[PDB]
Amino acid sequence: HWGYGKHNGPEHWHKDFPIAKGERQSPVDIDTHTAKYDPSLKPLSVSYDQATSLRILNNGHAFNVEFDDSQDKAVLKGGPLDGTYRLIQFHFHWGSHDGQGSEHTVDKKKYAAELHLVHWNTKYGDFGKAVQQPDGLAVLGIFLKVGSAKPGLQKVVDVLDSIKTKGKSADFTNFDPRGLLPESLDYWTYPGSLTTPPLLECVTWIVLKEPISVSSEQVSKFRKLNFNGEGEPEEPMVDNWRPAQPLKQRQIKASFK
Ligand SMILES: [Cl-]
Ligand SMILES: [Zn+2]
């Protein structure tokens, strides 16, 4: 089974998932000098007022906050997207220390972590059908940098102690993901893939320019989670990120100059 270790980590995924060497893999390094301004890209429309969070789960790879995606007003649209995409879950990737942990990089700079807000294209009926199409999902990626604390993240970080091992979960209602967004919605966009197996090339990536600031203590709580199930010897959940992949024949566009 895949993981992030020496023997089952990202360098090994291609054996079970040959698309790992595909033409539209994620993440990627974003070169700010070559990314091209496209002043025809509409503002991003992020509507989370009626986002209805359900639970938080340690899935053995990261933790996912799951949403009720029948909420037809809880949607991402605009920007580079046609039609409407529904929020299903968000999760993070992070490092064994503050100097690494993001999946996308910006001019080769890695951030302490990266948040992914996963949405599926309503035109395909559900998430399971959408992942089989090239315009099936839209993932909103947001970098975390160490600085002042992020108040809207605190409810997430405080609940992690009770879901420390694989399989554990907690009810997690009335979490408002708007508390995780930076001031600015300027972004870079490119077509790419899920960054975990099955690595399907079904994602329009929308990566915000502006990181959110989280405190050193908040991010260190991510690192207290464990990959293993209860009753195995603790295996700290850190460095669950996939490194930058070849950009091949893709152009990264920017919503801003
Ligand atoms: Cl804290
Ligand atoms: Zn992710």
Descriptive notes:
The chain has 257 residues and is mainly beta. The protein has 4 helices and 15 strands. The protein has a single domain, classed as Roll (Carbonic Anhydrase II). A hairpin with a 4-residue loop joins strand 4 and strand 5. The structure holds chloride ion (CL) and zinc ion (ZN). Chloride ion binds next to helix 4. One of its GO terms (molecular function) is zinc ion binding. Belongs to the alpha-carbonic anhydrase family. Its cofactor is Zn(2+); Co(2+). It is found in: Cytoplasm; Cell membrane.
How would you summarize this macromolecular structure in one to three sentences?
It is classed as lyase. By secondary structure, the chain is mainly β. The protein has one domain: Alpha carbonic anhydrase (Carbonic Anhydrase II).
Characteristic terms for this protein:
monomer, mainly beta, Carbonic Anhydrase II, binds chloride ion, binds zinc ion, cyanamide hydratase activity
Number of helices: 4
How many β strands by DSSP?
A: 15
Name the ligand types: chloride ion, zinc ion
Radius of gyration: 17 Å
Instruction: Report the span from N to C terminus.
Output: 43 Å
* 3D shape: globular
Pfam families: Carb_anhydrase
GO molecular function: arylesterase activity; carbonate dehydratase activity; cyanamide hydratase activity; zinc ion binding
Enzyme class: lyase
Keywords: Acetylation, Cell membrane, Cytoplasm, Disease variant, Lyase, Membrane, Metal-binding, Osteopetrosis, Phosphoprotein, Zinc
